[PDB]
Amino acid sequence: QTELNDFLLDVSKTYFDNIVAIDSLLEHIMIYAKNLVNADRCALFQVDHKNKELYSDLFDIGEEKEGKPVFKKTKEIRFSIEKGIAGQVARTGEVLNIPDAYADPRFNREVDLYTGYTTRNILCMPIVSRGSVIGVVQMVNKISGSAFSKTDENNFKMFAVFCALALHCANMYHRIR
Amino acid sequence: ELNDFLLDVSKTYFDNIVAIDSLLEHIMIYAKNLVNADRCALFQVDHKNKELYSDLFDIGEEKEGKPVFKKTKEIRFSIEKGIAGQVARTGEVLNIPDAYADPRFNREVDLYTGYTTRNILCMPIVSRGSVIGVVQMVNKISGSAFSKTDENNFKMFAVFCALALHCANMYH
Ligand SMILES: Nc1ncnc2c1ncn2[C@@H]1O[C@@H]2COP(=O)(O)O[C@H]2[C@H]1O
Ligand SMILES: Nc1ncnc2c1ncn2[C@@H]1O[C@@H]2COP(=O)(O)O[C@H]2[C@H]1O
C-alpha cells in the first residue's frame, strides 16, 4: 500500500532531517492515522499535571493545505482531568474506541457545546514519557461510517506503541552527543 | 495490560547498556505479539568477516510474566547463507511462507537448535545506507504464513531497531 510506503519514507526523512524528530513525527503520525482510520478530525491535548487539567495543543478544524491537514495551535480548550474520554485516557493510559460518544457517560459534551461540532465516534490514546501519561491524542468521527472499526482500533493501538517507543528513543538519544 | 505495557515501554534506565537492551527486548516482544510469531531474533552484520551473528534470540522461555531472550553471539554464519543473509546482502524485505521450500533458506540453524522453522518474516535494519542487522519473526502461530498486513506492521517497528542499534554503536 502506497500510503504506508509513503509514511515509512516520511519517518526516515524526519529522523534524517531533524535534531529532535518528536514533533514532526507526532504530526506525521496524526496525519497518517487520520487518513488510515478515515477520521474527520483529530487533536493532541497536553496534560497539565500541576493543575490536574488537559489543554488543547493541536486541534484540527478541517482546514487543509494542499491535500494534507493543517492543525490549529491553541491552548484554549482546557478542562479537568476528571472529565471526558480524554480525561479517562489521561488517568489510566488506556486506548479507547468509543462507538457512540453521547451514549457514553464519561464523554465531555462541553467541547461540542462550545464548537457547534457534533462528536459521534472517538479513538483515544495516551502519549507516555518516563512512566507517566503526558498527553492525549484523539481521532474524531468515522467519515461515512457509524463507528471506528475493529481494524481502526487495532491500528490505533499500534500507533500508541509506536509513539511510546518513539518518545523513549528520543529521551534516549538526547542523552548522547 | 496494553496500558501497563505502554507505561512500561516509556520507563527509562540510567544505565545506558541496560537501557538499550531493555528497549530491544520491548520491541521484539511487541513485534512477536503483533504478528503472532512463535519466535524472533535479531542478527548483526559483521562486515569484515562477511557474516551474520545472533544478538538476541528467542528460545520460547520465560523468567516471569513475559518472553525473555538469549543474549548470545553463538549463531553465526556466512552472509551467503539463509533468508537472513539474503536480506543482509540486498536490503530487501522477505516474507517466506514455507522455509524448507525456499532454496535460500539456511537449514543448518534448525539442525543446531533442534527447532523446526516453517515461515519467516525478515527485515533489514539500515543505518546510513548500510544494512547493519536483520530482524526476524518466525513461525506464525494461528495461520499458515505471515500475511502482507503482518509484514507491513512488522516494518513499522524496524526503525526502532535501527535507532536502538545505532545507539549501542555510538556507545562503543
Ligand atoms: N478536532 C476536534 N474538533 C472538535 N472537537 C474535538 C476535536 N478533537 C476533540 N474534540 C472533542 O473534544 C472532547 C474532549 O472530551 P472528550 O474526549 O469526552 O470528547 C472530545 C471531542 O468531543
Ligand atoms: N528465535 C529463533 N529460534 C529458532 N530458530 C530461529 C530463530 N530465529 C531465527 N531462526 C532460524 O535462524 C535461521 C537463520 O537463517 P534463515 O534466515 O534462512 O532461517 C532462520 C531460522 O530458521
Side-chain angles (χ1 to χ4, degrees):
Chain A
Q1 161 123 155
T2 294
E3 302 151 34
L4 172 81
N5 287 14
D6 291 342
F7 171 74
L8 258 11
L9 295 174
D10 288 327
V11 310
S12 25
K13 246 63 252 271
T14 288
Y15 278 98
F16 179 77
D17 282 344
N18 289 272
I19 286 126
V20 172
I22 219 295
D23 294 343
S24 173
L25 280 171
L26 238 49
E27 269 194 65
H28 268 137
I29 282 149
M30 292 171 69
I31 286 156
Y32 176 63
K34 186 186 175 176
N35 187 55
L36 184 61
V37 302
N38 325 284
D40 182 52
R41 292 217 189 168
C42 65
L44 170 63
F45 296 92
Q46 303 297 349
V47 166
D48 194 338
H49 282 285
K50 317 63 125 286
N51 292 288
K52 316 195 195 297
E53 289 165 333
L54 293 154
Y55 59 95
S56 65
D57 179 354
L58 298 166
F59 204 81
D60 186 354
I61 53 167
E63 281 191 338
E64 279 187 351
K65 268 157 193 100
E66 61 198 320
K68 54 135 267 152
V70 229
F71 304 136
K72 184 166 170 161
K73 234 245 201 299
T74 285
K75 302 180 156 153
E76 145 162 80
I77 293 124
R78 176 176 287 274
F79 52 87
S80 151
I81 201 171
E82 295 308 334
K83 289 202 251 218
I85 307 306
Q88 171 75 219
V89 168
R91 297 180 319 266
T92 60
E94 286 171 323
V95 173
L96 307 176
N97 183 13
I98 309 299
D100 185 346
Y102 281 55
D104 196 301
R106 298 164 299 183
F107 169 67
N108 183 10
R109 195 181 166 173
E110 260 190 307
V111 183
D112 282 5
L113 254 358
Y114 175 58
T115 62
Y117 187 77
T118 298
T119 299
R120 296 180 288 97
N121 319 126
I122 304 181
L123 280 162
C124 190
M125 73 185 184
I127 303 304
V128 290
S129 186
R130 307 186 164 89
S132 296
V133 181
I134 58 163
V136 173
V137 168
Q138 302 186 321
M139 305 285 132
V140 171
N141 286 11
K142 184 65 181 207
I143 283 158
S144 48
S146 79
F148 291 112
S149 77
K150 190 82 205 156
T151 304
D152 291 342
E153 178 173 350
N154 289 343
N155 280 327
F156 208 66
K157 290 185 202 290
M158 188 173 330
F159 298 131
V161 178
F162 186 100
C163 290
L165 287 162
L167 266 304
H168 185 121
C169 276
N171 288 145
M172 167 181 82
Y173 258 105
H174 189 81
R175 305 179 56 198
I176 327 149
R177 350 90 262 132
Chain B
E1 165 111 82
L2 170 66
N3 68 147
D4 295 330
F5 183 71
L6 294 170
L7 288 171
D8 188 43
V9 160
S10 81
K11 181 202 169 157
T12 56
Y13 298 92
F14 188 72
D15 184 292
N16 294 311
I17 61 155
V18 171
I20 278 150
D21 290 337
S22 175
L23 213 206
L24 281 174
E25 286 190 10
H26 287 273
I27 296 151
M28 299 301 272
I29 283 155
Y30 179 66
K32 212 188 138 166
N33 188 253
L34 180 58
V35 305
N36 212 34
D38 193 51
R39 291 249 200 132
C40 63
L42 167 94
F43 295 91
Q44 296 183 71
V45 183
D46 174 347
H47 299 291
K48 190 183 325 194
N49 296 291
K50 328 132 202 84
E51 282 164 358
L52 289 186
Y53 59 94
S54 52
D55 176 16
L56 286 183
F57 203 86
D58 190 355
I59 61 157
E61 280 200 298
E62 192 196 309
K63 162 114 223 292
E64 210 153 329
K66 289 203 153 228
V68 112
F69 305 99
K70 290 317 185 138
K71 259 289 207 231
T72 176
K73 297 175 200 251
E74 92 189 71
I75 300 179
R76 155 180 306 260
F77 49 89
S78 155
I79 206 168
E80 278 314 320
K81 291 186 185 155
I83 302 312
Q86 177 78 44
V87 174
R89 269 180 1 261
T90 59
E92 77 190 302
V93 182
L94 292 175
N95 185 174
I96 306 305
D98 180 349
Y100 279 84
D102 189 306
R104 309 157 296 182
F105 169 59
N106 182 6
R107 307 167 169 216
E108 309 172 343
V109 180
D110 272 9
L111 256 25
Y112 176 81
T113 60
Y115 189 80
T116 296
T117 295
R118 299 180 274 113
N119 40 69
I120 303 167
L121 254 186
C122 183
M123 70 181 4
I125 301 165
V126 166
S127 184
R128 294 334 205 95
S130 168
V131 186
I132 60 157
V134 324
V135 197
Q136 289 192 328
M137 294 291 123
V138 168
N139 284 15
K140 172 86 163 185
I141 297 181
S142 286
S144 159
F146 296 107
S147 61
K148 180 63 176 189
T149 295
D150 287 340
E151 185 184 319
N152 283 347
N153 286 338
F154 180 37
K155 219 186 317 183
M156 164 145 317
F157 293 84
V159 68
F160 301 117
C161 295
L163 290 162
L165 243 41
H166 190 193
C167 262
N169 285 178
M170 292 198 128
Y171 216 80
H172 31 256

